[PDB]
Design a protein around this ligand. Structure first.
Ligand SMILES: *[C@@H]1O[C@H](CO)[C@@H](O[C@@H]2O[C@H](CO)[C@@H](O[C@@H]3O[C@H](CO)[C@@H](O)[C@H](O)[C@@H]3O)[C@H](O)[C@H]2NC(C)=O)[C@H](O)[C@H]1NC(C)=O
Ligand SMILES: *[C@@H]1O[C@H](CO)[C@@H](O[C@@H]2O[C@H](CO)[C@@H](O[C@@H]3O[C@H](CO)[C@@H](O)[C@H](O)[C@@H]3O)[C@H](O)[C@H]2NC(C)=O)[C@H](O)[C@H]1NC(C)=O
Ligand SMILES: Nc1ncnc2c1ncn2[C@@H]1O[C@H](COP(=O)(O)OP(=O)(O)NP(=O)(O)O)[C@@H](O)[C@H]1O
Ligand SMILES: Nc1ncnc2c1ncn2[C@@H]1O[C@H](COP(=O)(O)OP(=O)(O)NP(=O)(O)O)[C@@H](O)[C@H]1O
Ligand SMILES: *[C@@H]1O[C@H](CO)[C@@H](O)[C@H](O)[C@H]1NC(C)=O
Ligand SMILES: [Mg+2]
Ligand SMILES: [Mg+2]
Length: 1810
């Protein structure tokens, strides 16, 4: 048993080591995919970040001016490495770095600080009062140095310098660098309307640079606010909320006041009182234009409503022009209500595009990064959410309390420390499963192909019957595949950790995962090999099934919410799905920085995944187990269409796992018996055999005979178990077949009609392999093999492989294989076919040696051989037995008579018969009676014929005693432009007829990829339906167990004592434990006292409040340092049992802070204005009077002091709003009257967006790009696996030599190639139509646009045009028509993916430096491959469609040269040049009797000779021995020549050289004066070829072949039918004329071959053994047609191995030994020259004594078991015949024959010289 495994692994290694040009690429193919992801590793360094702090965002409650300067200042939210001054505990200004604040400080220091300034102001006021009453300069002079120092201040100096380009000439660069100047002067950082308004709007939207900013700013400026609960309380809230709007209205009315003044200033300047002392023009235009601009702005934004639906329908219309800011809805405070509830809540309806998604609170997968992109991360602030919430909350607070509580609000993000920030993980998470699953599509396909092919060409079944069970071969295949794949993964093992792909994970567990996946893959291979039984089909539908098995992995990527751990496991029964889940968990562990190192196994990577890597491993191993069980079941239930009979599925329910026939003589133990057996083929309808009843015995060498196609191979293969019998007894001696299958398959040799052998194996190894399956060790086989080598004669080719041997050598090797070992039941079939008699007699001697205890059923067609060996002959005619018994009984019961075998331009055939009848009343045979002999008249006639040998011209004769050939013959009786058009139409109809009869191989290699992409598209259609975003309540305890804190800064103020004490204790921290009904799920809790457990300095204290909070005590320290250092420690500590890395920091409120406020004190400026008005007397204006009234309120709302800073983290998507609301509630509760309990008064906010069927334009767009990207390589796979199916027919035509036989006809290579190309492009154009039909049916909007549909159709058609002439050269390289398909499909798919995905990664979703240019370089370089032109074009079309629909959503050419124009108009040239390359590679880079013959051939020669040879030679490379050498024979027309010789001499070699297959090494072959080295198109016009190996399409009938070659020979289309009928009636091919070529017997096949050779009537016919494997009575018809052609005068050359056929036809002879001729004369010349005397044979010791006593001159030649042969000359044959007939009973002679130097004897005498 283990010895069998050792032998099988030995032979597998032996065959593999001969192919170390394909094993290596099989081993290293998966590693070839990982070349892009080493360059991505090297080109994506981990760009580490630096810790940077955030600016303090302002808020409208902090003051209108601070809010505006903030929104203009921190537009980009630039984080700063150093901490900001506003992050200190007490500073909330953070703006003195600006030059405006600096010059204001300089003004406040130089003036209004020294007492001199106050004295000057008082003196000026007194002087003004005195002048007013009337209607010193020393202090003014003393003020001159002060102002001189003021104007010379460096702050003012740089201010004056930078204000030089202050909008000179209307603006130096408009809105290009003026923003920079404004930032310098206000944002000092260390890095229905007027037609004028409409015109400005249209001008600004015209500019695309300013159009993007004018998308959200317009709702912010001229938007509208809708409030549905129009309550009086709501209205007073809004009156307390529009305070900043009122301030803006006042400041807008201020600029309108320059109309009451107008020219009053100019009146003073021109004609006032005391104008004589004794600009305005340049500034007034600016004032008026900014007045107009402020007039254009809309300031009334609140609009009432009553219904939510009305609010939504108005908001939609407003946002159509971007005029809807936000919608505020209060669930409480109904319009009929007018009071303030103690607890008030509102829900802010908003657009989805300007709010974050409510269904999710954070990123699903944690990563590094502060999440601080100003345009998308901070969607609340620039979207107008935080401002609106602040305004409404300030309104409600001022409406509730009456202390007005002036406290500003600022926000400040917690800074992030330095991290890695690698971009490789983003592409890794989306591409790694693909590259890890596509690396396993080539090896599985190759293994499936190898197994199915081995099952196909008769390799598993030929050894299964010998000694091997299916378990043995199955486990050897399993172990071999496991070893190879283990080597593959071991090469893959140390490739990524040393490739720097991973750095933390242990590279040992993934090795186990890879071996589990290897087991899964080999089990899949076993299953798939059991599924198929055809080479082409299995090669085709191999990777498609695997890839569509990987397909549903994308579904879980789409459905990230539906999938659970149980749901993951449920569909994890597929190996690729479990593999992909393992891959994604590995990248999840790697992205966290921990990786899988013997610790993360059994642990979920992200929150409640509840799925383990060990769980995936368990799923994979159980998948392998169930797959193996199913494979075993299917193998033992469905072996396939051909092979062992199929057991039924009930094998597991059982507990156990008339007078012409001779009677049986005694001593005949029945070994094999088959009675009443009938076999029927379903398509034919006529049974092959009907009523077989045989009695084979234990040791008799019984010969099986019958005409070709009767029952022979069927009957001799039905008892070896490889063909299912259709009822019939098969009992072989108590061990019945189909029951004792194992017992009968122990001692049984077998050789089929054809040859079965291992291609990559030598003779010696082939013998040793089968010399050890019977328990024999190495020693027995080694001692045994040499005897077989020396007996079979195959000792000169011991180590000469197996594929260089001809048919006879293969037959000899097969019979030697069946001979070795002990096999009682050998079933040798047809050992004598195309073999020389010299080896045939050796075969006979070997067979009679092994007949003592063996049953032999040897079958043949040489009746002489059967008579010599077979002691019992059974003949089967038309599938039924006709006669049986010993040959003596057969000739007794079927006539016993003598035959005259005289041979015969000389010949009369008119008087020889007359004189013969007078005595006894070129193959003339005369029947003579064996008995009633006169014994003297016969001798008299013999003497007369001897005397009349030459004059009659017969020249030869012989006498035989009843040969079996006559018995067989007796019993077989009763049983031009039009020419090219014709060529192309004939080839087209031939290909069409071939294809229509291959249905299962048409709709499986063509439309299967269409079904694949259809399934992929349908799966991509299935998507999670849109759901409206829920009403998200906003309270910080959503996360639970948070890490808050506070600062208690600036405790001096009594209000600051009031606050930061009611916040900490009573209502928890926000609204939890609020003494009423709110969020009942969260418990109130109990307080925990202070704690100071034992980064920076010391750990500050903390306290656990009643709510789930651990607020800290960072009150007196630097908050920034501790808050930025605790978070790394926090996330490090969070790794304990929480591998999802959840954080606890979520906010923080730092009380205290102050800013410098201008101490105008209100009425001081009003007094200044009144003074200037009463002095200048230019005042007076209703606008002036109404605007000079609210100055104290204007200044009060302008600024606010004593503010708070609200810290926040940014990972949470709602931290800002939640903690801002918490701080606002704390402020409101703090400043409250000391009358009510400050616990039952709070505010809760909800940020539910509008209930609109619209999603965020940042994931659906990415979702659409992904869904067009997941269906972007499926189409590549489909259109990469289609063109490979067109090379199978080409390579199978090349291998079986059918294409060359077509080239023998008058067909130019170009016409054949263009017909093939036209058929391919017509055939290809059923895939493009199908895929575009699927596209239009699914309405793929990326391509179903009418503008792009013709573009897509043209792209597909051109891709098909330029893809066909690329696989044409492959047919000239491969040899097996299933490895070429796999290799080509894999290579095409690999280049397609590695051309498309690289550009997709490099250009989209990535902006590279110094390699982005390389992307353009390769795009200009990679266009040569049509696959790149297809994939890149398709993805670019999809991307362009995405961009167009994005711009259409914002509000808004396929034939382009750079889009598809360069793709299309530079691919047709590629197609035509590749076709020209195909044509180029098609045309290029592809002793005595003979002494007089050679001299006459050279130096002139006969002018009428047809194919005069000249010194033909040939030596195969690597052999150092010429196959043929120096051949020169001239043939006259009308002469039938004979090329006889030993097997392997080179007859086939010479024919294939002279027919144009093999190039001539040296010499010339002058065919009618035309050299073969010259053009052979005209040489092909006068030839007909019948090769030794059949070359025909098995899916056609003979009549189709005849029509095809009649069209190809130039025959007009009206005589085709009549000449076809003439040919079929002259060759007898009429019963099977209209039958398929696949179901043809060997004799039938050769008959068809010679029939197709003779068509067209050329003056030359070439035959390469037309009679090998041909039954008698079929030779005679060939002889008749050949002699008809000869008497027609056209020369014919014939070769054979039967001696009778040549002497019947062939005139001249040429014995070829080792490629060297030995004779040239005709039959009688050789018989007279070579050999002497007469040859007499006898068939039964005393006979030898009689012969030596009567005949002095004789030789005991050919001494065998039961026959004798001699060369007695004597004087005349009459005396020898007389003495033989005298001693008939004395010698016990059974069979005798007398002749004179037969050609077989001289043949074996020539053959024995070696
Ligand atoms: C509160 O803690 C922060 C540390 O996070 C202290 O801020 C640090 O202050 C120094 C002052 O020199 C900053 O230095 C910077 O140097 C560059 C280069 O000369 C200069 O251009 C900057 O203007 C600045 O002076 C430093 O960046 C900053 N932060 C760091 C990283 O230490 C702050 O002083 C602490 N407050 C206390 C305890 O007073
Ligand atoms: C909150 O304050 C803003 C800013 O002051 C208010 O907007 C302005 O309010 C006034 C007073 O209602 C509006 O004036 C009215 O204009 C119409 C149109 O000519 C006129 O017929 C009335 O006699 C009155 O003068 C003004 O249009 C409006 N906005 C502008 C463009 O200045 C706002 O109304 C206040 N919101 C609340 C909560 O009521
Ligand atoms: N798969 C098949 N379907 C239909 N007919 C078949 C099939 N295989 C063989 N046959 C025919 O069944 C008959 C079998 O007769 P048989 O004498 O066994 O032929 P053979 O031995 O295979 N060739 P030969 O030695 O020349 O007679 C022939 O007519 C075959 O052509
Ligand atoms: N590709 C090959 N390389 C090397 N030797 C080969 C090759 N093909 C065949 N041979 C051998 O070289 C000789 C070629 O002569 P071949 O034409 O086979 O002889 P043959 O007498 O015509 N044989 P056959 O027609 O089958 O009876 C034989 O000995 C072949 O076995
Ligand atoms: C002015 O800005 C600098 C910048 O760091 C700061 O240190 C300083 O405290 C500021 N002074 C005032 C008065 O705001
Ligand atoms: Mg046969
Ligand atoms: Mg040959």
């Amino acid at each position: 048993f283990v010895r069998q495994i050792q032998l099988l692994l030995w032979k597998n290694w032996t065959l593999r080591k001969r192919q170390k040009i394909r094993f290596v690429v099989e081993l290293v193919w998966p590693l070839s995919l990982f070349l892009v992801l080493i360059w991505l590793r090297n080109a994506n360094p981990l760009y580490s970040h630096h810790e940077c702090h955030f600016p303090n965002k302002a808020m409208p409650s902090a003051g209108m001016l601070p809010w505006l300067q903030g929104i203009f200042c921190n537009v980009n939210n630039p984080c700063f490495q150093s901490p900001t001054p506003g992050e200190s505990p007490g500073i909330v200004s953070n703006y003195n770095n600006s030059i405006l604040a600096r010059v204001y400080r300089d003004f406040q220091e130089l003036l209004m600080n020294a007492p001199e300034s106050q004295h000057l102001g008082r003196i000026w006021t007194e002087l003004h009062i005195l002048s007013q009453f009337m209607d010193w300069g020393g202090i003014l002079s003393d003020m001159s140095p002060r102002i001189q120092e003021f104007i010379h201040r460096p702050s003012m100096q740089d201010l004056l310098w930078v204000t030089r380009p202050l909008m000179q000439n209307g603006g130096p660069e408009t809105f290009t660098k003026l923003m920079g100047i404004l930032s310098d002067l206000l944002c000092g950082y260390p890095e229905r309307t007027t037609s004028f308004c409409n015109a400005l709007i249209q001008s600004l939207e015209s500019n695309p640079l300013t159009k993007i900013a004018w998308r959200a700013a317009k709702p912010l400026l001229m938007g509208k606010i809708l409030y549905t609960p129009d309550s009086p309380a709501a209205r007073r809230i809004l009156k307390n909320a529009n305070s900043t709007f009122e301030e803006l209205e006042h400041v807008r009315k201020l600029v309108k006041a320059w109309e009451e003044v107008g020219p009053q200033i100019w009146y003073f300047f021109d004609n006032s009182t005391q104008m004589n002392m004794i600009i305005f023009n340049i500034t007034d235009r600016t004032l008026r234009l900014v007045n107009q601009y402020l007039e254009c702005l809309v300031l009334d934004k609140f609009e009432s409503y009553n219904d939510e639906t009305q609010l939504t329908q108005r908001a939609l219309s407003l946002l159509e022009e971007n005029m809807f800011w936000a919608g505020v809805v209060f669930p409480d405070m109904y319009p009929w209500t007018s009071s303030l509830p103690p607890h008030v809540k509102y829900k802010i309806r908003m657009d989805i595009d300007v709010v974050e998604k409510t269904n999710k609170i954070k990123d699903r997968y944690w990563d590094s990064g502060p999440r601080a992109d100003p345009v998308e991360d901070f969607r609340y602030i620039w979207g107008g959410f935080a401002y609106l919430q602040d305004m409404v909350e300030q309104g409600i607070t001022r409406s509730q309390v009456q202390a007005e509580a002036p406290v500003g609000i600022y926000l400040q993000q917690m800074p992030y420390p330095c991290f890695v920030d690698d971009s490789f993980m983003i592409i890794l998470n989306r591409c790694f499963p693909i590259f890890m699953v596509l690396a396993w599509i080539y090896s599985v396909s190759m293994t499936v192909k190898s197994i199915v092919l081995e099952k196909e060409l008769r390799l598993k079944e030929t050894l299964k019957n010998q000694g091997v069970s299916n378990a043995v071969i199955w486990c050897t295949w399993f172990l071999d595949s496991f070893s190879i794949m283990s080597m593959s993964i071991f090469l893959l093992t140390i490739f990524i950790m040393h490739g720097r792909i991973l750095h933390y994970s242990d590279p040992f567990i993934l090795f186990l995962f890879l071996l589990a996946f290897s087991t899964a893959t080999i089990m899949l291979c076993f299953l798939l090999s059991t599924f198929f039984s055809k080479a082409s089909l299995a090669a085709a539908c191999s990777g498609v099934i695997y890839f569509t098995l990987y397909l549903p992995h994308i579904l879980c990527f789409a459905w990230q919410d539906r999938m659970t751990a149980e749901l993951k496991k449920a569909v994890s029964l597929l190996s690729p799905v479990a593999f992909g889940f393992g891959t994604e968990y590995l990248v999840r562990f790697e992205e966290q920085g921990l990786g899988l190192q013997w610790s993360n196994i059994g642990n979920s990577p992200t929150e409640g995944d509840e799925f383990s890597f060990l769980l995936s491993m368990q799923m994979m191993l159980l998948d392998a187990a169930v797959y193996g069980l199913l494979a075993w079941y299917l193998d033992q239930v469905f072996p396939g269409d051909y092979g062992t009979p199929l057991p039924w599925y009930f094998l597991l329910q059982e507990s156990y796992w008339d007078s012409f026939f001779e009677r049986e003589h005694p001593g005949w133990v029945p070994g094999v018996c088959v009675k009443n057996l009938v076999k029927i083929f379903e398509p034919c309808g006529r049974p092959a055999v009907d009523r077989l009843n045989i009695t084979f015995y234990e040791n008799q060498i019984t010969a099986f005979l019958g005409h070709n196609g009767a029952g022979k191979t069927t009957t001799l293969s039905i008892l070896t178990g490889l063909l299912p019998p259709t009822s019939g007894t098969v009992l072989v001696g108590g061990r019945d077949i189909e029951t004792s299958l194992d017992a009968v398959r122990q001692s049984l040799g077998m050789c089929p009609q054809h040859n079965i052998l291992f291609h990559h194996l030598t003779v010696a190894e082939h013998m040793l392999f089968y010399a050890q399956l019977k328990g024999k060790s190495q020693e027995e086989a080694q001692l045994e093999m040499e005897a077989m080598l020396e007996d079979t004669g195959l000792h000169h080719k011991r180590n000469e492989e197996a594929q260089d041997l001809s048919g006879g050598m293969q037959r000899k090797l097969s019979v030697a294989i069946a001979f070795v070992g002990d096999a009682k039941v050998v079933i040798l079939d047809e050992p004598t076919s195309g073999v020389d008699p010299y080896s045939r007699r050796s075969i006979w001697d070997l067979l009679l040696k092994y007949r003592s205890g063996r049953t032999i059923i040897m079958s043949t067609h040489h009746m002489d051989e059967a008579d010599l060996l077979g002691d019992r002959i059974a003949i089967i005619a038309q599938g039924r037995l006709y006669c049986s018994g010993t040959p003596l009984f057969l000739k007794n019961c079927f006539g016993t008579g003598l035959y005259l075998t005289l041979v015969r331009l000389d010949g009369d055939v008119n008087e020889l018969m007359d004189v013969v009848l007078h005595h006894v009343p070129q193959e003339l045979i005369f029947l003579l009676p064996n008995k009633n002999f006169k014994h003297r008249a016969y001798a008299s006639l013999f003497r007369e014929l001897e005397e009349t040998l030459a004059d009659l011209g017969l020249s030869s004769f012989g006498i035989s005693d009843t040969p079996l050939e006559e018995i067989f013959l007796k019993v077989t009786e009763d049983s031009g432009t039009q020419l090219v058009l014709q060529h192309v139409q004939a080839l087209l109809v031939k290909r069409f007829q071939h294809t229509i009869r291959s249905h299962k191989d048409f709709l499986a290699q063509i439309v299967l990829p269409a079904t694949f992409v259809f399934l992929a598209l349908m799966l991509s259609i299935v998507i999670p339906p849109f759901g409206e975003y829920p009403a998200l309540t906003l309270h910080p305890w959503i996360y639970g167990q948070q890490y808050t804190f506070f600062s208690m800064d600036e405790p001096g103020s009594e209000q600051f004592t009031v606050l930061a004490d009611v916040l900490l204790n009573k209502p928890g921290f926000g609204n939890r434990c609020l003494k009423e009904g709110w969020l009942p799920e969260y418990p109130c809790g109990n307080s925990t006292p202070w704690k100071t457990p034992s980064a920076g300095g010391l750990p500050p204290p903390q306290r656990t409040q009643r709510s789930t909070e651990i607020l800290q005590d960072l009150t007196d320290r630097n908050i920034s340092d501790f808050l930025v250092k605790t978070y790394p420690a926090l996330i490090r500590s969070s790794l304990k049992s929480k591998f999802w890395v959840n954080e606890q920091r979520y906010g923080g409120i730092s009380i205290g802070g102050k800013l410098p406020v201008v101490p105008i004190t209100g009425e001081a400026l009003v007094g200044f204005l009144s003074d200037l008005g009463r002095i200048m007397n230019v005042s007076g204006g209703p606008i002036t009077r109404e605007a000079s009234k609210e100055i104290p309120d204007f200044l009060k709302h302008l600024e606010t002091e004593d503010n708070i800073k609200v810290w926040f983290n940014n990972k949470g998507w709602h931290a800002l709003v939640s903690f801002l609301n918490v701080a606002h509630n704390a402020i409101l509760r703090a400043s409250l009257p000391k009358d009510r309990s400050p616990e039952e008064y709070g505010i809760t906010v909800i940020s539910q967006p509008l209930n609109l069927t619209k999603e965020q334009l940042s994931e659906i767009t990415v979702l659409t790009t992904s869904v067009d990207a997941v269906v972007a390589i499926c189409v590549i796979f489909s259109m990469s696996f289609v063109p490979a199916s067109f090379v199978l027919y080409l390579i199978q035509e090349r291998v079986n030599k059918s294409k060359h036989l077509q080239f023998i006809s008058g067909v130019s290579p170009t016409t054949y190639w263009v017909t093939n190309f036209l058929w391919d492009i017509m055939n290809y154009s059923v895939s493009a139509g199908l895929v575009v039909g699927i596209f239009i049916g699914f309405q793929k909007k990326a391509y179903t646009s009418p503008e792009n549909l013709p573009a897509l159709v043209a792209l597909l058609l051109l891709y098909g045009w330029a893809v066909i002439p690329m696989m044409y050269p492959a047919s000239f390289l491969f040899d097996v028509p299933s490895t070429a398909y796999v290799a080509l499909s894999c290579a095409n798919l690999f280049i397609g993916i590695n051309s498309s995905a690289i550009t997709f990664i490099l250009e989209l979703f990535e902006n590279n430096r110094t390699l982005l240019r390389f992307n353009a370089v390769l795009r200009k370089l990679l266009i040569v491959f049509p696959h790149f032109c297809l994939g890149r074009g398709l993805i670019d079309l999809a991307l362009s469609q995405a961009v167009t629909d994005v711009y259409a959503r914002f509000g808004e050419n396929p034939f382009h040269w750079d889009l598809i124009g360069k793709n299309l108009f530079a691919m047709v040239v590629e197609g035509v040049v590749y076709f020209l390359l195909t044509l180029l590679v098609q045309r290029h880079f592809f002793d005595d009797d003979v002494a007089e013959e050679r001299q006459r051939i050279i130096t002139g020669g006969n002018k009428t000779d047809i194919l005069r040879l000249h010194e033909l030679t040939k030596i195969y490379p690597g052999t150092s021995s010429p196959a043929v050498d120096r051949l020169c024979v001239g043939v006259r027309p009308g002469e039938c020549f004979g090329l006889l010789g030993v097997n392997g001499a080179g007859k086939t070699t010479t024919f294939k050289m002279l027919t144009g297959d093999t190039t001539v090494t040296s010499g010339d072959a002058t065919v009618a004066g035309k050299s073969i080295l010259t053009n052979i198109s005209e040489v092909h016009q006068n030839m007909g070829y019948c090769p030794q190996f059949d070359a025909i399409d098995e899916l056609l009938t003979g009549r189709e072949h005849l029509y095809l070659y009649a069209r190809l020979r130039g025959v007009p289309a009206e005589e085709i039918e009549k000449v076809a009928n003439w040919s079929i009636k002259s060759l007898g091919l009429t019963v099977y004329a209209d039958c398929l070529a696949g179901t043809y017997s060997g004799g039938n096949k050769r008959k068809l071959s010679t029939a197709i050779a003779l068509i067209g009537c050329p003056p030359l016919v070439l035959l390469d053994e037309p009679t090998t494997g041909m039954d008698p009575q079929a030779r005679r018809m060939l002889w008749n047609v050949i002699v008809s052609i000869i008497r027609e005068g056209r020369a014919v050359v014939l070769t054979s191995h039967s001696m009778e056929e040549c002497e019947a036809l062939c005139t001249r002879l040429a014995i070829m030994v080792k490629g060297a001729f030995r004779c040239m004369g005709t039959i009688q010349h050789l018989k007279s020259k070579f050999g002497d005397g007469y040859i007499v044979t006898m068939k039964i010791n005393p006979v030898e004594q009689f012969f030596q006593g009567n005949f002095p001159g004789s030789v005991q030649r050919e001494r065998h078991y039961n026959m004798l042969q001699f060369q007695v000359s004597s004087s005349s044959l009459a005396r020898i015949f007389q003495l033989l007939l005298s001693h008939k009973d004395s010698l016990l002679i059974e069979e005798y024959s007398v002749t004179q130097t037969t050609l077989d004897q001289v043949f074996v005498n020539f053959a024995k010289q070696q």
